[PDB]
Structures are given as C-alpha cells and as structure tokens.
Amino acid sequence: VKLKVEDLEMDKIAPLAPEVSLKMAWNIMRDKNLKSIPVADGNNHLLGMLSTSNITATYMDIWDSNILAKSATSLDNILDTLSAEAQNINEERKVFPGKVVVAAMQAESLKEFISEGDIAIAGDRAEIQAELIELKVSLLIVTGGHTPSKEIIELAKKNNITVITTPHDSFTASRLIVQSLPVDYVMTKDNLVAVSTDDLVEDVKVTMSETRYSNYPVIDENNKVVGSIARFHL
Amino acid sequence: LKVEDLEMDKIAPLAPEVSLKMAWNIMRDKNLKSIPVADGNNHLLGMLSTSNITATYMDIWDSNILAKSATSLDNILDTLSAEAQNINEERKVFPGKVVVAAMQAESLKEFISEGDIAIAGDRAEIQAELIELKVSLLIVTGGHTPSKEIIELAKKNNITVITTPHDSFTASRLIVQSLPVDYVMTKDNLVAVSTDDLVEDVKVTMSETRYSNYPVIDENNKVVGSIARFH
Ligand SMILES: Nc1ncnc2c1ncn2[C@@H]1O[C@H](COP(=O)(O)O)[C@@H](O)[C@H]1O
Ligand SMILES: Nc1ncnc2c1ncn2[C@@H]1O[C@H](COP(=O)(O)O)[C@@H](O)[C@H]1O
Fold first, then answer.
1. Which of A24, B160, B191, B217 has its CA at 20 to 30 Å from residue B110's CA atom?
2. Known binder of ligand: residue B214?
3. What sign does the dihedral A86-A90-A96-A98 (CA atoms) show?
4. Taking every annotated instance into account, which residue ranges of this chain make up the domain CBS (chain A)?
C-alpha cells in the first residue's frame, strides 16, 4: 500500500489561539524552532497560518496607527507585553481607538498632539497625567515603574480612564507595544493550503511543489487540526 | 544530475553593511525566507534569515545595541528618512543608549548621559541642553529643522544632529531597523553547496538540517545564488 500523510512522522504541535499576542506566539515558535504555525478556533478548526514573515512584516511595515484599534488589541495583551500593572480599568472599553503618542511636550501644548481616544505614554509628572486624563485618552501608560499618586488614580476612576504602569522607559515601551497585537490580525486567512491525514504522500508531493510555504497544516478526517508537515518530513 | 544542472534562485548577495530595513525590502520583494551575505569579492560571509531579523526586534533589551553593532549614520538617516544638519565626521560610532527626552530641561541630566542618542522635539532649550550634555546624536522629530543657533552650537561642540519627519513614538520603532545585516546574520557552521556536487549528495546533506536555503558557490568560491528543498 502506498503511503498516506498519517503514515509519516510530523510536527504534532498545538495550534495557537487567534487572540494570543505576537510576543506569546514568537516565544512558542522560537522555542520549537518553528518557521510557521497553525491558528485554530475553540473547536480546533483551521483559521490561519502564522509565519515569522508575517510577524516581521508587521514591525518593518507600519505607517498605520489605530493599528491597536484595527487589531482590537486587548488590554491583557498590552499588560503582558509591557510587564505592566493596571491602576484603573475602563471595564466597558474593549478597544483603544486612537494613536500611540509619547507625551514629550509640557502640559499646555499636549492638546496639539493628543486627542480623545489616544494612547499616551507619559512620565512621573502628576501635571502631565492630569492633563492627559482631562483630554480623555483611552489609555494612559506611565513609564519608569512610577505608579501614579492616589489623586491621579481617583481622577481616572471619576472619568473612566484606563491607566497602567510599566517598568520600561518611553523608548522601550514604544518598541514593545506592537508585540501586543493578536495573531489573528497578522496571520494568513485566505487560500490556505492544508493537507489531510489520508492524502497519498505522492499527491501531497505535487501539491507542495506548487507553492513555497515552510509548513502545511494537517487536518484529520473530522476537519480538525492535528499538526503540520514540511517538505522535510518527505 | 549536478547541482549546477538544477534551476535555482540567482539572487544577488547582500553587502554586510546593509541595514535590516533595506535587507527586508530586497527579501520581501523577491519573496525570500533567507539570503546570502557576501563580501566585495563575492565570497560568502553569512546567511540572513527573517528569523534573525525578527529575533532582533522581539528579543531586545540590550541598548548600546547601536554601539555593539557599529551602526552607521547613513543607516540611521535612511531608516528615519532623516537629514543631517551637523555631522561629527570623526566619529563612526554612537556609544550610549537611546533615550526619548520627554523630560523637562533641568531633569535631563538624570536620564541622559554623554554619548547617548537623544530623541527630542521642537524646543530650543531642550536641544541646547542635550548638546551641553554631549550626546553623540541628537535626533529631532516632527520635521522640525533646528534653528541656526542650535546648529552653530552643534558645530562648535562637534555634535551630530539630524531631523526626521517622524514623531518620537515612530522614530523609536524605526531606529532598530538601522542595524547592519552582519551583526544579525549567522556566521558559523554555514552549510553551502557547490555547483559541482551530486544532487543525490546534497539530498543527504540537506536532510541533516532544517534551513530554508543553502547558498550556492562555484568552484572559485563565488556566491552564484542559493537553493532549497523546493528545488
Ligand atoms: N500552508 C500555507 N497555506 C497558505 N498560506 C501560507 C501557508 N503557510 C504560510 N502561508 C503564508 O504565506 C506567506 C509565506 O509563508 P512562509 O513560507 O511560511 O514564510 C505568509 O504570509 C504566510 O502566512
Ligand atoms: N544555509 C545555512 N547554513 C547555516 N545556517 C543557516 C543557513 N540558513 C540559515 N541559517 C541560520 O539558521 C537559523 C535558522 O534559519 P532559517 O531556517 O533560514 O529560518 C538562522 O539563524 C539562520 O541564520
């Protein structure tokens, strides 16, 4: 009998969940030396492929802010990525709709640069933080590990502004934050070339030579993601 | 069947001083998982993967990174779409850390030290104090070219000063794309293949590793391209 895909020895790795961050994804991938990994849903049906090339394009190619918006990046992803902790959470805002801005300026001229719904990265100055609150940023990120005073926190409570503290400095926090993005915003979703447990190895061969992908997700006869295969397993 | 017989990617190798940005553009546009790096005589120096680029962006705490890597100013200018208003022509290296000068005048001394790379806005006072602190590189944001006065101060004190159209957040994201490929690429245990090898023998070689591509050399040890399992 000719060989089928299940007859091979492949990478039986658990697919990623679509809500996990680029950062969580890269750690999982790097630690298995994977060039790409499947994404699946709660029922373990194929949603996507995620390549290191996708991650990289996301860093190397961005004019676009509201990126946090378009990706619907969640607060948990930002806290994890910035090793941060929340002092107040607007529990009814799931999306941060504006752009990321380093509040470099002094208090009076912040309005020329920072709008309602923006994500502002500020330092340990109460004056700055109060003005960012009055401007109704969707998220205040305070740097240097300098947890804000109770007065500022109560003002965020009053106005329902999400406020968090990271130990990182503004530069570092600016480099990190894009690692927060969920995989599902970055992964490939269309024209997925998948392979069945029961396809003949000789058929898969043909199929694989048609494209140049590092890996192909393997799906069982019940349509569930079982792992992935590469040219190397042939 | 000889390796040369086969059909391959005939891609020109990267020069080792090229930035990650420029390198990614060439790869992205030729759809390359990896690419050879070679010297000015076309002898093999290394292999550069997108994994090596990504790892550089994800896993980095290490400032002085600009220093460790001898990142050049032309690389920073390109990446930041910047213009130089003064240049210290006797300094190839920027040795300190990158710091966003978000702070106020009198407080800068606590966070910024001599040799640092300061990202600043359109404030003469701040720019002047940064100069007085002897930063290696003052980067000015928002397309806000510094005043003649600030320019002459940089002149007398030999401080490199440049202006980028980008804001501080974006400058901070971009700057790391400046590093030269040779700081990032794999250098050792390079697995290469001769134009004049048995295709059956490159098959055994290849199965012992999981690399996307293997660079191809002729019998003069010149890099002619690369091949993959695909081929
Ligand atoms: N098996 C696949 N089917 C369809 N698209 C893929 C597959 N694997 C990767 N991709 C996508 O195709 C591009 C190149 O993938 P890769 O070869 O894995 O670097 C990236 O956008 C991937 O997300
Ligand atoms: N042909 C090769 N020989 C030796 N090392 C390589 C080769 N290609 C890539 N590498 C390195 O091995 C690691 C994985 O590369 P890749 O499989 O191309 O993502 C990266 O650090 C590469 O720089």
1. B160
2. no
3. negative
4. 9-65, 187-234
Q: How far apart are the first and last CA of chain B?
A: 13
Residues 6+ apart with CB under 8 A from B34: B27, B47, B48, B49, B50, B211, B212, B213, B226
Q: How many CB atoms lie within 10 A of CB B17?
A: 16
> Which of A139-161 are b and which e, b meaning 16 or more Cβ less than 10 Å from the residue's Cβ?
bbbbbbeeebeeebbebbeeeeb
Tokens 């600043």 — which residue? Answer: B120
B81 lines ligand 2 (CB under 6 A): no
3-class SS of residue B142: coil
Closest CA to B36 of B6, B22, B16: B16
Resolution (Å units): 2.3
Amino acid (one-letter) located at A136: K
Which of A54, A57, A58 has its CA nearest to residue A187? Answer: A54
Query: A193 in helix, strand or coil?
Result: coil
Paired sense of beta strands A162-165 and A139-142, if any: parallel
Cβ contacts of B152 within 8 Å, gap of 6 or more: none
Dist. CA B57 → ligand 2 center (Å): 17
Residue A16 bridge partners (DSSP) = A39
Q: Is the minimum distance from the CB of A230 to ligand 1 under 6 angstroms?
A: no
B73: phi then psi, degrees, rounded to nearest 5: -75, -30
The residues with which B62 forms a beta bridge, in sequence order, are none
Sign of the four-CA dihedral A39, A41, A46, A48:
negative
For residues A87 and A153, give the distance between their C-alpha atoms in angstroms, rounded to a whole number: 7
Going by the DSSP 8-state scheme, the letter that residue A4 receives in this structure is B
**Euclidean distance between CA atoms A210 and A98, whole angstroms:** 42
Interchain CB distance below 8 Å, B177 and A103? no
In a 3-state reduction of DSSP, which class is residue A134?
A: helix
Any ligand 2 atom below 6 A from CB of B190:
yes
Q: Which residues contact A68 (CB under 8 A, 6 or more apart)?
A: A95, A96, A100, A119, A177, A180, A181
CA distance B31 to B29: 5
Output the CA A37–ligand 1 centroid distance in Å: 9
Measured in whole angstroms, the distance separating CA B114 from the mean position of its chain's CA atoms is 23
| Whether A38 contacts A46, CB under 8 Å | yes
Question: How many angstroms separate the Cα of B42 from the Cα of each of B9, B10, B17, B37?
Answer: 16, 13, 14, 9
- Residue of B1, B9, B2, B62 whose CA lies nearest to B31: B9
